Ligand binder design. Structure first.
Ligand SMILES: [Mg+2]
Ligand SMILES: [Zn+2]
Lengths: 1089, 98, 146, 146, 93, 49, 98, 48
């Protein structure tokens, strides 16, 4: 679909009926719903939704009206309006501003005592806006609000084994959007009890009577089960008033009751909308279950007596072991337990909904203050502006984007990292779950995840299973349930109609696999088909027993997983490792698209938003390293600013380079500038290297990697890293901090680079301890200059200075602020971690000279050597498949079709019959190059410059030993593999300490590389030292090196003075204990024996 | 001059047995990765796929003697649990000899 | 008494902390043993044989076995009776003069098996000869009885 | 070229498939319970996996590098070789039960979509299982050290 | 080095011997310039210099007086923060 | 998984060892159906019960 | 039994035993390596992320598993799923109440 | 109790409480003269 994409021949044999949707639509559509954008309104009104209502409109309608006790005063809100954004994205990121737009709402005040109306526009604050990239710019930084998985409101039934009697017991809980919980259960003694708002358990009949039920009505509705009759006959309460009084006592202990509040307490607690509601999603769920309020649309959001009675009846029927239940007048429904892990129950709070909830809290605070201050002002002159307090709402919005877990720094390590961050599904966070809740259980892969959450992607750290990634084809319901598309199938012929099914909908049908052999019109050729059944059970069924089919084999995978070639040949563990490692590859100075890859790099790169795409068709007018000018055919002129050597949140380079020249004609949507990790508009996370699979002198033992010096000489794996150093000058109790070129008691040479302001000049080389900006402070002055930390160096590439004298919005107390950016080129070196896309990872153990590497018969040295022993035992043989195909891509192929096409090539599309050298190919994850096709292509490779083929049909070549010169006795597998430079460089993992700062809380050495701390000497290390019998070393570690200050300094002086280290003894912490013992009149004495 | 014949203790957490800490003679090397002998990896349960290791410096004469005598890697070839050899050929070495 | 040191291959030296060495040697391979299920709910997994780490925990804590097997207090000849779900075993001591009875042995636990070299004597049965401390029922003997 | 597939892998499977069919047949007549039917299928497919492994071991030449590494004691097992070039075999539900449908495909051939999805379950389960086992190991080790 | 450690029950004479002086004044520190009281819980002459090298009267403030007793205070100003390790006694009627 | 499955099978067989067969049923078609604590099938005869 | 009721005493000793076991389990968890000090090639799940001190302490308790025929017969307050009464005419009214 | 609802400290609590020496911390110390770095295969090195 991309007008100007590079050609990449594909091995796919299936035809896609549906193209991948906007990958980051989950963010943009949600936010457009929040602000009620015109696009969202048009999209929603076309779906069938009548009179769409936005998030802001929803919360404002919920808020209004605001009225007093007498109902004389009223205040209403309407028409939320957004003005133009205050500053551009670039300016927002330059001046540490927030990308926000003013918000205006019309507030109308009504005074029934006179009937006069007063409408007025009220400024509600600067609402932060979402960029087209799906990010929020707060205080100059880029942030992503991750979607949150939460158990949707509804009614949930479960059965658990009693830990006392081992008995199975049934329970149900009603989970509302807001308000008191309501739980029912059957205990180990077959007594039905109810817990209202998590209080003490009491018989359910008490609540039934509290709702106005009489004994006759209870015995009529119930009585099908003897346990309910037993509970009723064994209840010491009779009458609605009696039950209401008992509930009052068990909810509000001690305080006097009254008939006035007896009914009111329950009515407010569960039935009045201003205190309890099911949020229009709990209402829908509770209607679908229990068969209540069927047919007619959702009209009210609150609970009803019918819901409570139906829940009780359902619980009792489930306990009795029944499977079908029918409420009087309702639709018959199944009786079953509810799986809380099923995406039919778990829903997704999108960014818009989280922001809406925070706005709701702020509006509640505003409602409280308005309710307070209407009484304290003259009703004959009050206006909407005097009543309104906008400090709480703006405070709530400002706090959500600050100290909140869901709003997180954007993962700007590379474009794919940010793209996967936006499509992240986080189960934790406010309201998600806590440390005390499910561990092993909630982290499992559930059958309902298919096509909705990727089963492979998950962060390596403590959040395995708790954080997932949205599938490529999935989308969110208005209720927040994740749908996925399927093709209709009728009479055994696959139909072209596509339906977005939710997990609950999907469980009711039979779905066939994407790779179903079908005729031209879609009729299944096989009499039997592989399908997924209701309970996630895979089965083989008749071709006429299928209702739906997967749109594509990529249905179940996400972007990074979809970017792994030959994924089906790799075990799930290594696939997960490769998917996660793709997310942390550092951009290189030169980008290079994979020689062998998937058909996903281009779309992922374009959707990530780090490539500049022409807004509309036009002719390139002027191209520079900084900006691109396009003269559109419509007459308008566009100018795109390019980011050059900009620092990412993680410290990587975000340089953008144009890929067009003046006078070129560009179609709308065409890529005109590449991002950090793209070549011509597609992912270029790594480099294609010539690899030989063999053990080599033990330098690649235990997953170590051997690199050719070419990768250092030609800057193949070189990267640019930018670090930021910040320093502020403030007020004090003794004066203020001053910045100047003058620093006391320092040499003239250490401040040579400093300019008139005392700031290091741009382009200056700075290393460990060099002064960046000189700052002098009151204790006759004291030096407090900023300096380069230990082991850091680079070139000064930028300075940003903010001052209070220039009306810069620095925080209170700060008078000035300076940021200095230092850039460094890092070559590839021993200890840096390299990895492929198949989970094969290792640190560089040796970088051999060019003439030491094994070299091909034509003299070409291999770039990397990988050990043979790593592959077979890890079931990541896909890395081998790639290695072969990567060769066939580097050297073109030509299938001989003289006497007809060969049998192995009968499936290859004709476009794959031949290709030139340095060609790029695409092999989708579950539909691509087959083993036989690849085997034939290996034998169909073109000759080299000299007219001979080096890699034979087996994929192996004879390699000469660069050191001894003799040919290796056996042929070795040689190919081209795409490898990544991961962000785990040894340059920022080496840490050492002889002496340094100490924690004043315990006097022990600090902990951390940035704190110049020491290594942990754990208790198990103490055990290991004890087993050696090394008493002296253990004592030295425990006493001198950690705790003893006097011994510490004594040993330091002894070492620097060249005398044998003294004997530790009589520890201070032992002297304190001895003196405490003496304080208790205990004559503690040390005996010489 | 000062690093010669001065043992250093290499350790890798978690330390599940005494052979998780071993004394070695240092050699100054270019680069910033610690070069570990292939045979002792089994004792450390270490693989060169990103693993890190900590280094401690004995200072006193008694500590240095303990490291040089009790804890030196060449003196701990046999595992204490069963007496079987531990610093013995592995992986590439086994296939090469085979 | 401790004897040859495994690490050095020579006689253990005075002062060596053999206790920590033994503790580490026994604990380090614990991860290879089978363990109780990590699932939060469900039935007790100890009903089926789980004789891995839980068995070691039971042994080192001297706790009574779940499938306790009574041991013979006296050597003699065994006479056995059976019922619907209980056995009634008795030992008549050859040198003794009093019958020693085991009256409440559930049938859900099997009898001991001999597996003689060539006689293939199989399961314990009436008329067999039992020594002191022999297991009468197939299971785990209680350390306190021993 | 050197990841060889035994030619007797297509026959064995179909033979066992017939047996599987028979089991389902007896289940349709009510001669089998669901859990017992799954147990029978699991046993049959375990036998099939063992047969495929034996065939793979027989077929491979002695000098093949893949089998050479395993037979020399360097790395891996014949189980991994079977999973690579034979058949993956049975996989477990998230609740630990075996799925009666085996993964008849091998990573050499490439797994289908549903086979891969069902395989992911135990793959993710192991990540938490390995972390959990260390807790029990450390508990026992600390008791022994004390 | 030592091989054994024993705790006995101290007689009044032993408690007296451990002490450097009586803590007679039930006050911790004054308010004006927060100077500890004489014979108080923080007395200079019993426990030593308040923090380091300063007697109560202040006429001895020089680091050289390692082995000098201030005549009026009687304070034996000494290094090693003796007041953290020197202890007193209280005679009770 | 395999260890627990095998242990469950062994425990089930041990439990069934006592009183394996409850009885027999003669079908009007003159067939025979043996009822007991375990399902035993002839794997060599199409798993006939 | 129902007329007199239970004295509702406090089981201080068992509670203290549970507290001590939980403290020991928490100490065991604290004995493991923390995330900050990990030397592994990549971050991974730790035992402390999945199990709490109370769960680990309970994991090592005896957790008796008596049979139902034993569990119910020893519990005066057990509610049975079904009751069969042979020669039922002989039961007194109080037996029927029970 | 006096100021605030907190009991007055006593000497015996210095011995009983987790403060002091008798009750262990069960946590590792951080030690000087220590370092940490990535490891690579030194095939040329001798065993010591
Ligand atoms: Mg590792
Ligand atoms: Zn004085």
């Amino acid at each position: 679909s991309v007008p100007g994409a590079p050609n990449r021949v594909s091995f796919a044999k299936l035809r896609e009926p549906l193209e991948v949707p906007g990958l980051l639509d989950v963010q943009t559509d949600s936010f457009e719903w929040l602000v009620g954008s015109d696009r969202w309104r048009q999209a929603a009104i076309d779906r069938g939704e009548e009179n769409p209502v936005g998030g802001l409109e929803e919360v404002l309608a919920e808020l209004s009206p605001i009225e007093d006790f007498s109902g004389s005063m009223s205040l209403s809100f309407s028409d939320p309006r957004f003005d133009e954004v205050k500053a551009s994205v670039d300016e927002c990121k330059d001046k540490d501003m927030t990308y926000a737009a003013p918000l205006f709402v019309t507030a109308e005040f009504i005074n029934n005592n006179t009937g006069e109306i007063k409408s007025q526009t009220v400024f509600m604050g600067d609402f932060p806006m979402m960029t087209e990239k799906g990010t929020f710019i707060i205080n100059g930084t880029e942030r992503v609000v991750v979607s949150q998985l939460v158990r949707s409101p509804g009614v949930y039934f479960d059965e658990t084994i009693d830990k006392s009697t081992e008995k199975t017991l049934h329970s149900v809980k009603v989970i509302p959007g807001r308000g008191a919980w309501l739980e029912f259960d059957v205990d180990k003694r077959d007594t039905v009890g109810v817990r209202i708002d998590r209080k003490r358990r009491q018989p359910v009949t008490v609540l039934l009577k509290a709702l106005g039920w009489t004994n006759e009505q209870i015995v009529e509705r119930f009585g099908f089960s003897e346990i309910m009759m037993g509970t009723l006959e064994k209840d010491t309460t009779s009458g609605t008033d009696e039950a209401l009084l008992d509930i009052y006592r068990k909810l509000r202990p001690g305080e006097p009751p009254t008939k006035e509040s007896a009914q009111t307490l329950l009515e407010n607690l569960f039935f009045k909308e201003k205190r309890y509601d099911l949020a229009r999603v709990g209402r829908y769920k509770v209607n679908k279950k229990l068969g209540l309020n069927a047919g007619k649309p959702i009209t009210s959001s609150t609970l009803t007596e019918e819901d409570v009675v139906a829940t009780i009846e359902y619980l009792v029927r489930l306990h009795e072991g029944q499977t079908s239940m029918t409420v009087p007048g309702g639709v018959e429904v199944p009786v079953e337990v509810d799986d809380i892990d099923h995406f039919g129950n778990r829903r997704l709070r999108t960014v818009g909904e989280l922001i809406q909830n925070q706005i709701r809290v702020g509006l509640s605070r505003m409602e409280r203050v308005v309710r307070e201050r209407m009484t304290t002002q003259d009703v004959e002159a009050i206006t909407p502006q005097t009543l309104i307090n906008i400090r709480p709402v703006v405070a709530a919005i400002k706090e959500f984007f600050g100290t909140s877990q869901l709003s997180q720094f954007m993962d700007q390590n590379n474009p794919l990292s940010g793209l996967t961050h936006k499509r992240r599904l986080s189960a934790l966070g406010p309201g998600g779950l806590s440390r005390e809740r499910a561990g092993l259980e909630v982290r499992d892969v559930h059958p309902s995840h298919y096509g909705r959450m990727c089963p492979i992607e998950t962060p390596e750290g403590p959040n395995i299973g708790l954080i997932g990634s949205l599938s490529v084809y999935a989308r969110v319901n208005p209720f927040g349930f994740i749908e996925t598309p399927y093709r209709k199938v009728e009479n055994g012929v696959v139909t072209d109609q596509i339906d977005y099914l939710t997990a609950d909908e999907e469980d009711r049908h039979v779905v066939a696999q994407a790779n179903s052999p079908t005729d031209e019109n879609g009729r299944f050729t096989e009499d039997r088909v592989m399908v997924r059944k209701k309970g996630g059970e895979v089965e083989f069924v008749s071709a006429d027993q299928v209702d739906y089919m997967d749109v594509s084999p990529r249905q179940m995978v996400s972007v990074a997983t979809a970017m792994i070639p030959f994924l089906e040949h790799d075990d799930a563990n290594r696939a997960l490792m490769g998917a996660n490692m793709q997310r942390q590859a550092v951009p290189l100075v030169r980008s290079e698209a994979p020689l062998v890859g998937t058909g996903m790099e281009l779309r992922a790169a374009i959707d990530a938003g780090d490539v500049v795409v022409a807004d509309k068709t036009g002719v390139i007018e002027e191209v520079s390293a900084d900006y691109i000018t396009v003269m559109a055919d419509d007459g308008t002129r566009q100018s795109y600013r390019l980011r050059k050597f900009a620092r990412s949140n993680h410290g990587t380079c975000a340089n953008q380079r144009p890929i067009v020249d003046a006078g070129q004609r560009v179609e709308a949507g065409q890529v005109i500038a590449d991002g950090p990790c793209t070549q011509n508009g597609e992912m270029a996370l790594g480099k294609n290297l010539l690899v030989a699979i063999m053990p080599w002198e033990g330098h690649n033992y235990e997953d170590a990697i051997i690199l050719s010096n070419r990768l250092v000489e030609e800057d193949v794996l070189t990267s640019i890293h930018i670090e930021e150093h910040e320093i502020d000058a403030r007020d004090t109790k003794l004066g203020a901090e001053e910045i100047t070129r003058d620093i006391p008691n320092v040499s003239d040479e250490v401040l040579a680079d400093l300019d008139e302001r005392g700031i290091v000049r741009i382009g200056a080389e700075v290393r460990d301890g060099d002064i960046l900006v000189g700052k002098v402070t009151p204790k006759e002055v004291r030096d407090t200059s900023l300096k380069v930390p230990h082991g850091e160096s680079g070139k000064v590439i930028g300075i940003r200075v903010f001052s209070r004298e220039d009306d810069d919005e620095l925080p209170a107390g700060v008078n000035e602020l300076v940021r200095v950016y230092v850039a460094q080129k890092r070559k590839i070196s021993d200890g840096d971690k390299l990895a492929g896309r198949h989970g094969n990872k290792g640190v560089i153990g040796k970088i051999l000279p060019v003439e030491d590497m094994p070299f091909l018969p034509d003299g070409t040295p291999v770039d990397i050597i990988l050990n043979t022993h790593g592959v077979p035992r890890r079931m990541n043989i896909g890395q081998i498949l790639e290695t072969h195909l990567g060769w066939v891509a580097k050297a073109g192929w030509n299938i001989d079709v003289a006497a007809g096409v060969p049998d192995w090539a009968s499936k290859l599309p004709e476009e794959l019959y031949s290709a030139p050298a340095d060609s790029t190919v695409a092999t989708p994850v579950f539909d691509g190059a087959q083993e036989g096709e690849l085997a034939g292509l290996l034998g169909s490779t073109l000759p080299n410059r000299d007219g001979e083929v080096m890699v034979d049909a087996d994929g192996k070549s004879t390699l000469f030993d660069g050191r001894s010169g003799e040919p290796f006795p056996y042929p070795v597998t040689v190919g081209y593999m795409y490898i990544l430079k991961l962000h785990h460089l040894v340059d920022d993992k080496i840490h050492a300490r002889s002496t340094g700062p100490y924690s004043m809380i315990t006097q022990q050495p600090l902990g951390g590389k940035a704190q110049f701390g020491g290594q942990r000497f754990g208790e198990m290390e103490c055990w290991a030292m004890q087993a050696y019998g090394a008493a002296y070393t253990l004592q030295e570690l425990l006493t001198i090196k950690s705790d003893d200050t006097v011994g510490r300094v004594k040993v330091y002086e002894a070492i620097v003075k060249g005398e044998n280290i003294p004997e530790p003894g009589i520890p201070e912490s032992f002297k304190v204990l001895l003196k405490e013992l003496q304080s208790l009149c205990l004559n503690v004495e040390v005996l010489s024996s | 001059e000062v690093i010669a014949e001065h043992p250093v203790l290499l350790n890798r957490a978690p330390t599940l047995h005494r052979l998780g800490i071993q004394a070695f003679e240092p050699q100054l090397v270019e680069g910033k990765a610690i070069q570990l002998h292939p045979l002792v990896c089994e004792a450390f349960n270490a693989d060169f796929d990103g693993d890190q290791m900590a280094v401690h410096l004995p200072l006193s004469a008694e500590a240095q003697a303990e490291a040089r005598i009790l804890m030196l890697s060449s003196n701990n070839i046999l595992s204490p649990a069963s007496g079987k050899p531990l610093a013995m050929p592995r992986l590439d070495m086994v296939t090469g000899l085979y | 008494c401790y004897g040859r040191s495994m690490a050095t291959g020579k006689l253990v030296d005075i002062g060596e902390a053999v206790g920590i060495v033994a503790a580490q040697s026994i604990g380090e391979p614990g991860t290879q043993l089978t363990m109780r299920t990590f699932h939060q709910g469900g039935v007790t997994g100890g009903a089926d044989i789980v004789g891995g780490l839980p068995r070691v925990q039971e042994l080192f804590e001297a706790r009574v076995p779940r499938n306790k097997a009574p041991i013979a207090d006296v050597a003699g000849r065994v006479r056995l009776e059976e019922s619907d779900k209980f056995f009634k075993i008795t030992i008549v001591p050859d040198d003794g003069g009093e019958e020693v009875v085991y009256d409440k042995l559930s049938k859900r636990q099997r009898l001991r098996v001999i597996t003689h070299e060539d006689g293939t004597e199989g399961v314990l049965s009436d008329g067999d000869h039992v020594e002191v401390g022999d297991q009468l029922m197939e299971g785990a003997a209680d350390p306190h009885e021993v | 070229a050197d990841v060889l597939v035994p030619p007797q892998k297509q026959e064995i499977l179909e033979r066992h498939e017939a047996e599987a069919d028979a089991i389902e047949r007896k289940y349709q007549r009510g001669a089998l319970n669901h859990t017992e039917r799954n147990e029978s299928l699991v046993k049959i497919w375990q036998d099939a996996t063992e047969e495929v492994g034996k065939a793979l071991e027989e077929f491979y030449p002695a000098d093949n590098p893949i089998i050479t590494i395993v037979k020399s004691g360097a790395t891996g097992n014949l189980t991994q070789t079977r999973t690579l070039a034979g058949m993956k075999g049975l996989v477990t539900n998230p609740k630990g039960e075996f799925i009666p449908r085996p993964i008849k495909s091998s990573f050499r051939e490439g797994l289908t979509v549903l086979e891969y999805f069902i395989n992911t379950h135990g793959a993710r389960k192991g990540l938490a299982d390995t972390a959990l086992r260390t807790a029990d190991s450390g508990y026992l080790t600390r008791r022994l050290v004390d | 080095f030592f091989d054994e450690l024993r705790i006995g029950l101290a007689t009044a004479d032993d408690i007296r011997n451990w002490s450097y002086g009586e803590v007679k004044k039930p006050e911790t520190i004054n308010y004006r310039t927060l100077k500890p009281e004489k014979d108080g819980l923080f007395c200079e002459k019993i426990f030593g210099p308040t923090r380091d090298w300063e007697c109560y009267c202040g006429k001895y403030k020089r680091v050289r007086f390692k082995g000098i007793i201030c005549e009026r205070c009687g304070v034996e100003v000494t290094r090693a923060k003796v007041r953290r390790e020197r202890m007193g006694h209280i005679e009770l009627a | 998984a395999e260890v627990r499955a095998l242990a469950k099978d062994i425990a089930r067989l041990n439990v069934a060892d006592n009183g394996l067969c409850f009885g027999r049923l003669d079908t009007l078609d003159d067939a025979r159906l043996y009822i007991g604590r375990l399902g035993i099938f002839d794997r060599d005869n199409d798993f006939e019960p | 039994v129902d007329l007199l009721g239970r004295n509702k005493a406090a089981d201080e000793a068992a509670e203290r035993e549970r507290r001590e076991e939980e403290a020991y389990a928490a100490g065991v968890l604290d004995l493991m390596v923390d995330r900050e000090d990990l030397m592994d090639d990549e971050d991974h799940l730790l035992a402390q992320d999945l199990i709490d001190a109370e769960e680990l302490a309970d994991r090592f308790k005896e957790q008796d598993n008596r049979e139902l025929s034993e569990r119910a017969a020893a519990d005066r307050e057990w509610t049975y799923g079904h009751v069969v009464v042979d020669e039922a005419q002989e039961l007194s009214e109080m037996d029927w109440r029970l | 109790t006096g100021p605030g609802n907190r009991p007055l400290k006593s000497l015996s609590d210095l011995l009983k409480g987790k403060q002091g020496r008798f009750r262990q911390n069960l946590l590792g110390k951080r030690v000087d003269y220590s370092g940490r770095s990535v490891i690579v295969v030194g095939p040329q090195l001798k065993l010591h």
